[PDB]
């Protein structure tokens, strides 16, 4: 790493200086490092230039705004300081070059939208790896090679991706936040493909409002290397995107493919939601097929079909994707199904707000021939507002509501429960069982063979906070034990 080589595309005159690490933070700036001084949210890194120089940085790249011309090379206390205008916009490219263009050294797939990012990225990484890639994810769980995912500027993004390349990754599925995009955090990434899941941005109901928002997004889009575009045609904004992108792949499970366009497409033609997942028949421009998904709910059919269409688009063979689909797993504690021969279907989900709970119940209902049970509670010593709302949701969208504890902390457990019940039209028909373990047991053992028991609120977590203590407790382990299986 050399300053001169780093800057060659932009500043031909730049001096030659060995560089160690690249950093935005003058505090962490070590000897031999490259300090980048950017202007941000009430904050000017340029004021920390003397600090970093005293900490022994090898060189500095600084925002030229008001202070210098673009590409002006100065020298303070020996150390070269180079000014670039619109540095925030160019940071991703600068960092890309610094870390030897990590997105050119693996297949990077970006997933954006309100919901389904985590699952869709997870499925992409899994499926690609099943087909022989070494796959990684960068998302809100964390970053890492599949199974080794550890829990954030444009530099950090390029640095993390470079780390994954170094660890041997050939494929990376990255969640892309709308916040990230607008702030140029992925501006210079070479995406092999870009997936759009959906949009639940309200405050867009005017055609004076909707227009600046869309215009801003179209512009940004035109500035990114998006690669192959894969778009959910069951979303209204999805169809607007598709109207203007003839090379994009449309994906649908609800009849929104317009085959007149002669584009690439993929649609589910029938889905049977059963007690251990979903059976999905689809047609596509790559040919037809049938998948057994071990994921629950309609949204997860959609996510799976997006992952499939993306991989097909990138040239992974249909036959191999089909042969491997059955090994695709849910994200731990996200509509995670537990079945055992001759027992009720049990689903562990982390849903802990009214919205999430409603979605999880609706999803579970599709798979439920019998009664749908909902085992849940609400956090103690936290905001109380959601309690009666979650109560009303359980009452409406389930047949049996079992109200129990969920991290009651220092608050009286029964007080929390009373707050939940107050939300119901007929609290008297709700079952209350204190001791979360006992409540789960009550549902699992009373439910019929074709009932579905949703156990909501904890998902992957392995603790129940009672008082000051984190006791060892898992919904997954509790369920697994009761059904005579492994978690």
Ligand X SMILES: CCn1c(NCc2ccco2)nc2ccccc21
43 labelled as ligand-binding?
yes
117 labelled as ligand-binding?
yes
Helix (H) or strand (E) holding 363: helix 354-365
407 labelled as ligand-binding?
yes
- Applying the rule CB under 6 A, the residues between 91 and 110 that interact with ligand X are 110
Residue among 10 and 221 whose Cβ is closer to ligand X: 221
Answer yes or no whether residue 10 interacts with ligand X by CB under 6 A: no
Helices first, then strands: H and E counts in the chain: 15, 25
CA distance 403 to 401: 6
CB of 369 to ligand X, least distance (A): 37
**Residue of 65, 73, 183, 221 that binds ligand X (CB under 6 A):** 221
177 labelled as ligand-binding?
yes
349 labelled as ligand-binding?
no
314 labelled as ligand-binding?
no
Smallest CA-to-CA distance from 124 within 141, 107, 140 is with 107
42 labelled as ligand-binding?
yes
Residue among 176 and 424 whose Cβ is closer to ligand X: 176
Structure tokens at 18: 């060995």
CB of 173 to ligand X, least distance (A): 12
CB of 111 to ligand X, least distance (A): 7
116 labelled as ligand-binding?
yes
With contacts defined by CB under 6 A, name the span among 32-40, 225-233, 290-298, 458-466 that binds ligand X. Answer: 225-233
Structure tokens at 228: 């192959």
**Residue of 62, 229, 291, 308 that binds ligand X (CB under 6 A):** 229
Residue among 112 and 128 whose Cβ is closer to ligand X: 112
Residue among 88 and 441 whose Cβ is closer to ligand X: 88
* 227 contacts 194 by C-beta, under 8 angstroms: yes
Structure tokens at 313: 């688009």
* 396 contacts 328 by C-beta, under 8 angstroms: no
CA distance 445 to 456: 17
- Applying the rule CB under 6 A, the residues between 148 and 207 that interact with ligand X are 176, 181, 191, 194-196
3-state helix, strand, coil in the chain (%, to 5): 35, 25, 40
4 labelled as ligand-binding?
no
Answer yes or no whether residue 241 interacts with ligand X by CB under 6 A: yes
- Applying the rule CB under 6 A, the residues between 425 and 444 that interact with ligand X are none
Question: Total binding residues for ligand X by CB under 6 A?
Answer: 17
24 labelled as ligand-binding?
yes
Answer yes or no whether residue 224 interacts with ligand X by CB under 6 A: yes
CB of 249 to ligand X, least distance (A): 9
119 labelled as ligand-binding?
yes
CB of 102 to ligand X, least distance (A): 16
CA-CA distances (angstroms) from residue 164 to 14, 112, 130, 292? 30, 21, 18, 31
239 labelled as ligand-binding?
no
Residue among 251 and 420 whose Cβ is closer to ligand X: 251
* CB atoms closer than 10 angstroms to residue 8: 12
* CB atoms closer than 10 angstroms to residue 371: 16
Please identify which residue in the block is written with the tokens 């990114």. 224
Smallest CA-to-CA distance from 279 within 287, 288, 289 is with 289
**Residue of 109, 231, 328, 479 that binds ligand X (CB under 6 A):** 231
CB of 384 to ligand X, least distance (A): 37
Dihedral, 127, 132, 192, 34 alpha carbons, nearest 10 = 110
* 296 contacts 372 by C-beta, under 8 angstroms: no
Residue 112, judged by CB atoms within 10 A of its CB (0-12, 13-18, 19+), counts as buried
Structure tokens at 162: 């470079």
Smallest CA-to-CA distance from 220 within 114, 144, 112 is with 112
CB of 195 to ligand X, least distance (A): 6
Long-range contacts, stretch 38-43, CB < 8 angstroms, 24+ apart: 38/63, 38/87, 38/88, 38/91, 39/63, 39/65, 39/87, 39/88, 40/88
* 276 contacts 343 by C-beta, under 8 angstroms: no
281 labelled as ligand-binding?
no
Q: Where are the alpha helices (DSSP H) in 99-153?
A: 117-130
Answer yes or no whether residue 117 interacts with ligand X by CB under 6 A: no
Answer yes or no whether residue 265 interacts with ligand X by CB under 6 A: no
Residue among 229 and 301 whose Cβ is closer to ligand X: 229
With contacts defined by CB under 6 A, name the span among 222-230, 281-289, 333-341, 473-481 that binds ligand X. Answer: 222-230
Answer yes or no whether residue 225 interacts with ligand X by CB under 6 A: no
Residue among 72 and 214 whose Cβ is closer to ligand X: 214
CB of 125 to ligand X, least distance (A): 17
Residue among 7 and 111 whose Cβ is closer to ligand X: 111
Answer yes or no whether residue 226 interacts with ligand X by CB under 6 A: yes
Smallest CA-to-CA distance from 97 within 182, 165, 150, 159 is with 159
Taking the chain, what is the end-to-end CA distance rounded to the nearest angstrom?
47
41 labelled as ligand-binding?
yes
**Which residues lie near ligand X (CB under 6 A)?**
110, 112, 176, 181, 191, 194-196, 217, 220-221, 224, 226, 229, 231, 241, 248
Q: Which residues line the annotated binding site?
A: 24, 26, 41-43, 113-119, 177, 183, 185, 382, 406-409, 457, 461
Q: Which residues line the annotated binding site for meso-2,6-diaminopimelate?
A: 382, 406-409, 457, 461
Q: Which residues line the annotated binding site for ATP?
A: 113-119
């Amino acid at each position: 790493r050399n300053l001169r080589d780093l800057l060659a595309p932009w500043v031909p005159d730049a001096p030659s200086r060995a560089l160690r690490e690249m950093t935005l933070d003058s505090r962490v700036a070590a000897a031999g490092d490259l300090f980048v001084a950017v202007v941000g949210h009430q904050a000017d890194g340029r004021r920390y230039i003397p600090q970093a120089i005293a900490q022994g940085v090898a060189a500095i790249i600084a925002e030229a705004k008001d202070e210098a011309t673009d590409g002006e090379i100065r020298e303070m206390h020996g150390v070269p300081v180079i000014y670039l205008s619109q540095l925030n916009e160019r940071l991703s490219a600068l960092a890309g070059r610094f870390y030897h263009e990590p997105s050119d050294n693996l297949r990077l797939v970006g997933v954006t939208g309100t919901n389904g990012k985590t699952t869709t990225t997870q499925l992409l990484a899994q499926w690609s790896q099943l087909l022989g890639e070494i796959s990684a994810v960068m998302g809100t769980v964390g970053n890492g090679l599949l199974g080794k995912v550890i829990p954030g500027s444009a530099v950090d993004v390029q640095h993390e991706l470079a780390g994954l390349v170094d660890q041997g990754a050939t494929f990376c599925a990255m969640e892309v936040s709308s916040h990230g995009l607008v702030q140029h955090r992925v501006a210079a990434l070479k995406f092999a493909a870009s997936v759009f899941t959906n949009l639940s941005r309200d405050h867009l109901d005017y055609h004076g409002d909707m227009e600046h928002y869309e215009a801003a997004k179209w512009l940004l889009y035109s500035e990114h290397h998006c690669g192959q575009a894969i778009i959910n045609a069951d979303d209204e904004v999805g169809r607007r995107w598709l109207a203007k992108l003839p090379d994009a792949v449309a994906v649908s499970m609800e009849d929104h493919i317009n085959p007149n366009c002669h584009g690439r497409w993929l649609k589910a033609t029938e889905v049977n939601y059963h007690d251990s997942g979903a059976t999905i028949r689809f047609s596509s421009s790559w040919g037809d097929g049938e998948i057994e998904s071990h994921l629950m709910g309609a949204f997860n059919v959609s996510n799976l079909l997006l992952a499939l269409a993306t991989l097909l688009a990138l040239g992974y063979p249909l036959a191999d994707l089909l042969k491997t689909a059955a090994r695709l797993q849910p994200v731990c504690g996200r509509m995670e199904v537990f079945t055992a021969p001759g027992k009720p279907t049990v689903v562990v989900d982390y849903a802990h707000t009214p919205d999430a709970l409603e979605k999880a119940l609706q999803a579970a209902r599709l798979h439920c021939a019998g009664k749908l049970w909902c085992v849940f509670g609400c956090g103690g010593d936290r905001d109380k507002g959601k309690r009666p709302l979650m109560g009303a949701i359980a009452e409406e969208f389930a047949d049996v509501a079992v109200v129990t504890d969920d991290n009651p902390r220092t608050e009286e457990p029964r007080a929390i429960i009373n707050d939940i019940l107050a939300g119901m039209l007929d609290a008297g028909h709700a079952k209350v069982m204190e001791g979360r373990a006992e409540a789960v047991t009550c549902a699992v053992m009373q439910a019929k063979e074709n009932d579905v028991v949703l156990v909501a609120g904890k998902g992957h977590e392995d603790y129940q906070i009672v008082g000051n203590q984190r006791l060892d407790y898992s919904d997954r382990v509790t369920v697994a034990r009761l059904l005579g299986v492994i978690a």
